[PDB]
Amino acid sequence: VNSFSGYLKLTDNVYIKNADIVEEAKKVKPTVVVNAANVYLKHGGGVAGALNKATNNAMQVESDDYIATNGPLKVGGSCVLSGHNLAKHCLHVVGPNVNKGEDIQLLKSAYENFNQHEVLLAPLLSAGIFGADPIHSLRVCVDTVRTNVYLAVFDKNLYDKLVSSFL
Numbered sequence: 001v002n003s004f005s006g007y008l009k010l011t012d013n014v015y016i017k018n019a020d021i022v023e024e025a026k027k028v029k030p031t032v033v034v035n036a037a038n039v040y041l042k043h044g045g046g047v048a049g050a051l052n053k054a055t056n057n058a059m060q061v062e063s064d065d066y067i068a069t070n071g072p073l074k075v076g077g078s079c080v081l082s083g084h085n086l087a088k089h090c091l092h093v094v095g096p097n098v099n100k101g102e103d104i105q106l107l108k109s110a111y112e113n114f115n116q117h118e119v120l121l122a123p124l125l126s127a128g129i130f131g132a133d134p135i136h137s138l139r140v141c142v143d144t145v146r147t148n149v150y151l152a153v154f155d156k157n158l159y160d161k162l163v164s165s166f167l
């Protein structure tokens, strides 16, 4: 039993809710919140911008030190950093950004990072400002992630479309 509430169950291991991931993280304090990161960990907008703002820019400060030491992530890759006031840990995962021309096949590699964590609160990778089709992202999630994932979808209209079209 865990503290996630109000989710619709899609599969054995994938759950979904119309929710603001920032507000959900603040309330649950999950072990892992996933950020929709880019390779530079520049958290300017979308989910990343919102998570970073909720940490009062502490996420960005930590991320800048990470990049200065380690260099950029790979598209499809990830790193574990602090969750600050939102979670124990933040798993920064880089899905492909279609608006930069990155290969959508890398979306599966991105979701594979979730399998290193037993339970996660996450957004749909490559959705929103990353330009991918969220219906496709949900399909890849369900077909790739084997650990327990709680998906937060900010837009109510999109949430309803994702549920109604789910096979």
Ligand SMILES: Cn1nc(O)c2c1CN(C(=O)c1cc(O)cc(=O)o1)CC2
Pocket: 020, 021, 022, 023, 045, 046, 047, 049, 050, 051, 053, 054, 123, 127, 128, 129, 152, 153, 154
């Ligand atoms: C600035 N702020 N603070 C918050 O709690 C939120 C925001 C803004 N926001 C996003 O930028 C966003 C975009 C998106 O595609 C998915 C998502 O989960 O969040 C949603 C929730």
